[PDB]
Amino acid sequence: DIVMTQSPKFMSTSVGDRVTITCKASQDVSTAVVWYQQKPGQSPKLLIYWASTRHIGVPDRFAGSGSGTDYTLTISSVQAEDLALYYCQQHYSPPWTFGGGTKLEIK
Amino acid sequence: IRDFNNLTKGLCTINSWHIYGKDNAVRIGEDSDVLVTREPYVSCDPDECRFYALSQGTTIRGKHSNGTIHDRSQYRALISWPLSSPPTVYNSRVECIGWSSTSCHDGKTRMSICISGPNNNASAVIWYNRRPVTEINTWARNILRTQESECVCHNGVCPVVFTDGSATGPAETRIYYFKEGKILKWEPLAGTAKHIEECSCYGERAEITCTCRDNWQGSNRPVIRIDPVAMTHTSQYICSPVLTDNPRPNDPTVGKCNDPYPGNNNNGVKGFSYLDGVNTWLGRTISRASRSGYEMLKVPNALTDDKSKPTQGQTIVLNTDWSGYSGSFMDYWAEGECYRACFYVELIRGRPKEDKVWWTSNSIVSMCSSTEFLGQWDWPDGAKIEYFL
Amino acid sequence: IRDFNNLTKGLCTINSWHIYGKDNAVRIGEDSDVLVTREPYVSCDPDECRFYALSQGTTIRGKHSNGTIHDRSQYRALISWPLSSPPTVYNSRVECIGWSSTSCHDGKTRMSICISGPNNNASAVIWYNRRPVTEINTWARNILRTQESECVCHNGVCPVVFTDGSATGPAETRIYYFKEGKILKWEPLAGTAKHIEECSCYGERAEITCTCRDNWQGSNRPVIRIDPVAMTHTSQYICSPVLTDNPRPNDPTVGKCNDPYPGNNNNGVKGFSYLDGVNTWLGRTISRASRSGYEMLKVPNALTDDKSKPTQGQTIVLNTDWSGYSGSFMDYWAEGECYRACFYVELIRGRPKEDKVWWTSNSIVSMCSSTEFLGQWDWPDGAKIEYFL
Amino acid sequence: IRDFNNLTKGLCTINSWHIYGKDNAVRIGEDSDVLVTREPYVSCDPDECRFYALSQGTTIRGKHSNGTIHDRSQYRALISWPLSSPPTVYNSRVECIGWSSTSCHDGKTRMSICISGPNNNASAVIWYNRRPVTEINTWARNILRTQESECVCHNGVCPVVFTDGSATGPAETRIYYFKEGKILKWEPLAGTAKHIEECSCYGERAEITCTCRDNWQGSNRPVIRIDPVAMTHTSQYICSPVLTDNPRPNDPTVGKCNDPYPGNNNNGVKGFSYLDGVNTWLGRTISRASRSGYEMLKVPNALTDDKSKPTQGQTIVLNTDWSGYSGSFMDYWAEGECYRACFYVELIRGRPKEDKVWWTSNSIVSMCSSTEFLGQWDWPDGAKIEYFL
Ligand SMILES: *[C@@H]1O[C@H](CO)[C@@H](O[C@@H]2O[C@H](CO)[C@@H](O[C@@H]3O[C@H](CO)[C@@H](O)[C@H](O[C@H]4O[C@H](CO)[C@@H](O)[C@H](O)[C@@H]4O[C@H]4O[C@H](CO)[C@@H](O)[C@H](O)[C@@H]4O[C@H]4O[C@H](CO)[C@@H](O)[C@H](O)[C@@H]4O)[C@@H]3O)[C@H](O)[C@H]2NC(C)=O)[C@H](O)[C@H]1NC(C)=O
Ligand SMILES: *[C@@H]1O[C@H](CO)[C@@H](O[C@@H]2O[C@H](CO)[C@@H](O[C@@H]3O[C@H](CO)[C@@H](O)[C@H](O[C@H]4O[C@H](CO)[C@@H](O)[C@H](O)[C@@H]4O[C@H]4O[C@H](CO)[C@@H](O)[C@H](O)[C@@H]4O[C@H]4O[C@H](CO)[C@@H](O)[C@H](O)[C@@H]4O)[C@@H]3O)[C@H](O)[C@H]2NC(C)=O)[C@H](O)[C@H]1NC(C)=O
Ligand SMILES: *[C@@H]1O[C@H](CO)[C@@H](O[C@@H]2O[C@H](CO)[C@@H](O[C@@H]3O[C@H](CO)[C@@H](O)[C@H](O[C@H]4O[C@H](CO)[C@@H](O)[C@H](O)[C@@H]4O[C@H]4O[C@H](CO)[C@@H](O)[C@H](O)[C@@H]4O[C@H]4O[C@H](CO)[C@@H](O)[C@H](O)[C@@H]4O)[C@@H]3O)[C@H](O)[C@H]2NC(C)=O)[C@H](O)[C@H]1NC(C)=O
Ligand SMILES: *[C@@H]1O[C@H](CO)[C@@H](O)[C@H](O)[C@H]1NC(C)=O
Ligand SMILES: *[C@@H]1O[C@H](CO)[C@@H](O)[C@H](O)[C@H]1NC(C)=O
Ligand SMILES: *[C@@H]1O[C@H](CO)[C@@H](O)[C@H](O)[C@H]1NC(C)=O
Ligand SMILES: *[C@@H]1O[C@H](CO)[C@@H](O)[C@H](O)[C@H]1NC(C)=O
Ligand SMILES: *[C@@H]1O[C@H](CO)[C@@H](O)[C@H](O)[C@H]1NC(C)=O
Ligand SMILES: *[C@@H]1O[C@H](CO)[C@@H](O)[C@H](O)[C@H]1NC(C)=O
Ligand SMILES: [Ca+2]
Ligand SMILES: [Ca+2]
Ligand SMILES: [Ca+2]
Secondary structure, rough: OOOOEEOOOEEEEEEOOEEEEEEOOOOOOOEEEEEEOOOOOEEEEEEEEEEEEOOOOOOOOOOEEEEEEEEEEEEEEEHHHOOEEEEEEEOOOOOEOOOOEEEEEOO | OOOOOOOOOOEEOOOOEEEOOOOOHHOOOOOOOEEEEEEEEEEEOOOOEEEEEEEEEOOOOOOOHOOOOOOOOOOOEEEEEEEOOOEEEEOEEEEEEEEEEEEOOOOEEEEEEEOOOOOOOEEEEEEOOOOOEEEOOOOOOOEEOOOOOOOOOOHHHEEEEEEOOOOOEEEEEEEEEEEOOOEEEEEOOOOOOOOOOEEEEEEEEEEEEEEEEOOOOOOOEEEEEOOOOEEEEEEEEOOOOOOOOOOOOOOOOOOOOOOOOOOOOOOOOOOHHHHHHHHOOEEEEEOOOOEEEEEEOOOOOOOOOOOOOOEEEEEEEEEEEEEOOOOEOOOOOOOOEEEEEEEEEEEEEEEOOOOOOOOOEEEEEEEEEEEEOOOOOOOOOOOOOOHOO | OOOOOOOOOOOOOEEEEEEOOOOHHHHHHOOOEEEEEEEEEEEEOOOOOOEEEEEEEEEOOOOHHHOOOOOOOOOOOOEEEEOOOOOOOOOOEEEEEOOEEEEOOOOOEOOOOOOOEOOOOEEEEEEHHHEEEEEOOOOOOOEEEEOEEOOOEEEOOEEEEEEEEEEOOOEEEEEEEEOOOOOEEEEOOOOOOOOOOEEEEEEEEEEEEEEEOOOOOOOOEEEEEEEOOOOOOOOEEEEOOOOOOOOOOOOOOOHHHHHOOOOOOOOOOOOOOOOOOOOOEEEEOOOOOEEEEEEEOOOOOOOOOOOOOOOEEEEEOOOOOOOEEEEEEOOOOOOOOOOOOEEEEEEEEEEEOOOOOOEEEEEEEEEEEEEEOOOOOOOOOOOHHHHOO | OOOOOOOOOEEEOEEEEOOOOOOOOEEEEEEEEEEEEEEEEEEEEEOOOEEEEEEEEEOOOOOHHHOOEEEEEEEOOOEEEEEEOOOOOOOOOOEEEEEEEEEEOOOOOOEEEEEEEOOOOOOEEEEEOOOOOEEOOOOOOOOOOEEEEOOOOOOOOOEEEOOOOOOOOEEEEEEEEOOEEEEEEEEEEOOOOOOOEEEEEEEOOOOEEEEEEEEEEOOOEEEEEEEOOEEEEEEEEOOOOOOOOOOOOOOOOOOOOOOOOOOOOOOOOOOOEOOOOOEEEEOOOOOOOOOEEEEEEEEEOOOOOOOOOOEEEEEEEEEEEEEOOEEEEEOOOOOOEEEOOEEEEEEEEEEOOOOOOOOOEEEEEEEEOOOOOOOOOOOOOOOOHOOOO
């Protein structure tokens, strides 16, 4: 099984900044990384698949990046509404393994 | 036929798609000796049509099928077998050795081109009438590659597109014009596409048209039109927002004609399209993200209008089954007023997605144009990955 | 033969039946790679006769044969293989895809018709000279179906009967006349039969005759005579009390000519008959209740006299062995003064009756008319359901 | 072709070697029914080229393959199968029985010669147009032997060399000239070679040339040039210090033309060479000591200059894979100005070196002359001796 590893487990930036969030995995998953965002008391939603393709209606300000084992979601212009847990998820082989989430606190 | 072919008809009115041929190769391969193939195509002779594909020198059930996911090995040939029979160890004919091919018949006999070697000392040999006649070394020493489907001839001239260089960069694609096996001429990629990979082609009214892969930065499709007589050509993109490559972004309301519609990076899948105005049909996977399902959609004037949408569909295979490569072919020698347009769909099985088995192979499924509006079925490879365990 | 055929002879005197060909497909399928078939037929070319049947895309012994009892799947083709060889993965040629067929040769080349799809969006494609040439959508969206045996041609014209609608109701049967693949004409069922299902046919003296299935309310048999030239036809029933469908009631002393002889409901089995006056022969199962045994009985004037009885028999297969479908065929191209009349018998095996194995497949057995009165043997499929466990 | 062949062209410029055909016979034989062969050759017809080899009457995986290391048995035939298919039980054609062969086509049809029997009552039968026409008894009752590769014809005349006597002694080699199957003439070995064993041949400009085995006392190679018209011949050695037999001593700076270059005793391996002046190429194993790897080296003027060295190479197969026999063949009937020169390499597997399996069989690998300087790949048999355990 592939193992999506996330660290840190909490992250904070102020309003208007950039933040970057590290998701890595066991072996080369060939960019097939998905990003979700789950805001407190809400379903997750699909941000990004193939580590870079923004899903319908997620804004330009969420950028996808990665390769091999190593992936990073970057948010820019950190709005007040961006506090949530971000989750990565492998989609190269079954079973689809998710990272453990990362809290984004806005400083 | 003792005289070379001319493309003298145009396409017939494509109003639905009937079934032409489906080998059940993987269902039959849990118990006959079928070879592990990948990259299929189907190409006709004046006297028969036959499926083709790259072999991996091992049967589905034998021990050496473990790892057939590797694209390139010195154990792969271009093999043919009769329509809807399996590529089996005993009915399969070998055409030429190596890991990327393209073959087509010139009216008189057939040409077949095989590419071989290491990634930086790879080499093409153009066979014609089952004898080797020309060889081509790499011009850029990075995995020299050609069509993976039927090439098309007019008056003794068959254009082949090749690409050598990277599927991430700028790569150096180069169109050749063979006649009877020899290099008549060749040309560097002219026109607007960024990168050209792996085309599938067709012919109507003395024009050879090709739909291809922008594996570099495109989710839309570079298309190459070749004049077999002038031995000349352009490239451009399909204007329609209905994107056919895969992985894909969502479909825009307004796609782009002359540059890669962006969203996905360094990834593609081989695919086709019939571009004939009001009578245009675009095939694409149902999945945005992976090779699942196959849909055929009428999108009138897709190549030109940058705001075109489907006016009709047809599901070749459900999103809950698997798809893969797709390319076109036509029975050029087939009595009538026009050309019955056809395509195949590679059904891929095994790894990386169904990883419980250590192999990867596939099935052909194949349809041709019916002018009547026929009802639709959807066409699964059909095997249960659990009986091979 | 470079010129279309004409039916210019009449039947030869049928005085006994010799063996023509029996594949031992199921006996050979416990150890070679035979495909699971069902619905066989046998049809000749000017140059060879070959068995046909619908495949189920899997071998007897492979794991996907489990459940081949399902009539319809997108994994069945019409396949041919040489006389008395098994339909094996490696010698079997595919003719066209789908679950109900009918094929015949017009003197020049052969036509083959395959029906496909879901029950309410099924579609027929008429192949001719191994190229598709016509397609037909459903006219009533309920399991569009055609002969399951050899169709017959005269002067370029080959009648096919089709049925779409239910085998419980009124259904809409429709006779087509193709020539070279195109729809020449077609006709709705004219004459006295209630429902027409699944015919088998033959030709003598410029007349194509057909014996069929009244799956609705008949234990006697609707018979269709077609004039290939006038492109016209009638339906009626076999008058004789000797009932040939199965399941069956006991035989009356006086059957009925113009309506379904009643007793059994919504059930049948495909079967044939040679209707030629004093020289008439009716095949039927020995079992009243199920597909066991096959008997051929001389019943002189069976089609007309409503009080006709056997004057002679011949057991093709014992009641303590299994039978199944049956249809007719003739070597139209075969030197002589008259037509040697022939038939096949599907030997069905597996489920639902021999349910210890999870599959259902069969054997052909086949006989042709001998004018001498030859001794008789009875001809078992032959396999032991216990060696597959 | 209805008229006998003439050798009217010379060799083409050999600047690199492309791939012509490789069956993956041993990789496919862990799961299809492939026969255990050894001693392959490849010879063309006007209409097709096909691989040949001696069979051992058993499949790789069946129990009787245990001990196929024994050269001679009354269970071996000369069999052919299409290019790059495996010699499989079902596609393999038998040519004639016995344990040493040589076959070639005379323009009109083909001859095939098989030798058979015990070592001291062995016998050759020359088949021609698949009928036996001449027989030859032993002239020295010690394992009468002929080429193990394509023999070559000119104007109806095909020289064959045979040897009977020991591969340790003086043995009695004898050149025959057949025409249409009959003994036209024959000659005792004339010229400077000590012992002649097992030649491989070729033809250019009305000359049939042969490179052979000095199994007696030579690590260099006796070469026989035959004038098919005069029906006459000489023997000599390859002058070049690059030694091609194997096992081998190190290469001298100055080899010897007219006597066996010494170092190794009673051992050899079948091998070839194209001797054409500046355009000469010598194939040899990479291993000094055993059958590993295969290299092709340009050694200009090798037959004559006693101080010649490589000016260019090409590795056919790495030293860390296995090689074996090698002989030459050419598509004599192949359109062009010159002769595309070709060779095969027997990939041997099993015992005695990979002794974990009880059998010994092999693969063909085969290349032909490219005038362009193509990149190189190396071509492994490919099977894992561990999946047969
Ligand atoms: C008997 O058989 C007949 C004949 O076979 C049946 O008729 C055919 O049935 C088809 C299904 O109804 C029908 O197809 C549809 O035709 C319309 C034209 O009015 C066409 O627009 C439809 O195309 C969309 O639909 C499929 C899903 O059902 C999509 O997967 C496909 O992409 C098309 O949708 C996308 O296209 C546009 C741009 O993407 C958007 O407008 C649309 O929102 C959608 O976007 C999403 O999907 C994309 C990929 O899935 C993705 O990239 C994007 O980001 C979005 O996620 C469809 O073709 C045939 O027209 C009809 N033909 C005929 C002659 O009748 C009949 O119903 C059967 N009857 C019975 C009793 O069985
Ligand atoms: C050597 O070989 C030769 C040549 O092969 C042998 O000669 C042949 O042998 C046959 C057996 O004797 C013989 O057949 C019989 O011919 C008579 C004419 O005189 C014919 O009526 C017979 O037909 C009935 O018999 C079988 C059972 O044996 C039935 O299963 C069949 O249905 C026929 O019976 C039914 O028909 C009528 C209406 O149904 C009724 O009259 C009758 O009661 C019966 O009813 C029941 O059966 C039905 C189905 O089984 C059912 O639907 C109904 O409800 C009832 O339940 C039979 O054909 C051949 O004529 C004869 N031919 C020649 C040239 O000789 C020879 O004997 C062999 N000799 C040696 C030494 O081996
Ligand atoms: C892309 O592909 C191209 C085209 O394929 C590549 O180019 C080819 O690459 C070859 C490898 O570099 C090259 O071959 C060499 O050419 C020289 C001429 O300048 C030739 O002398 C070389 O031959 C010796 O080398 C091999 C080992 O590498 C030996 O195993 C062989 O025997 C030759 O060595 C022996 O020969 C003499 C007498 O024996 C001695 O001078 C020498 O010391 C040596 O002796 C030992 O070896 C014997 C057996 O191994 C043994 O009996 C003796 O006792 C000693 O132990 C070699 O052929 C091709 O010329 C070149 N061709 C072209 C057109 O370029 C290119 O590099 C590739 N590029 C990329 C990016 O992949
Ligand atoms: C093909 O067309 C050319 C003109 O484009 C003509 O000269 C040639 O003979 C034609 N060949 C055939 C078989 O139609
Ligand atoms: C082959 O498959 C086996 C299991 O069947 C697997 O463990 C092994 O790593 C695979 N690959 C190779 C090169 O053996
Ligand atoms: C078939 O019979 C018709 C008359 O029904 C005739 O015109 C035609 O040429 C005949 N063809 C052959 C081959 O007998
Ligand atoms: C297949 O056969 C097995 C036993 O061999 C049976 O238990 C199963 O229900 C059958 N059907 C399917 C769909 O697996
Ligand atoms: C072969 O050449 C000879 C002269 O060596 C000539 O007489 C003969 O007819 C030729 N045959 C062919 C088919 O070239
Ligand atoms: C055959 O192989 C077996 C093991 O598979 C070996 O023990 C035996 O000695 C071999 N030779 C013969 C003649 O049986
Ligand atoms: Ca792309
Ligand atoms: Ca009935
Ligand atoms: Ca030696």
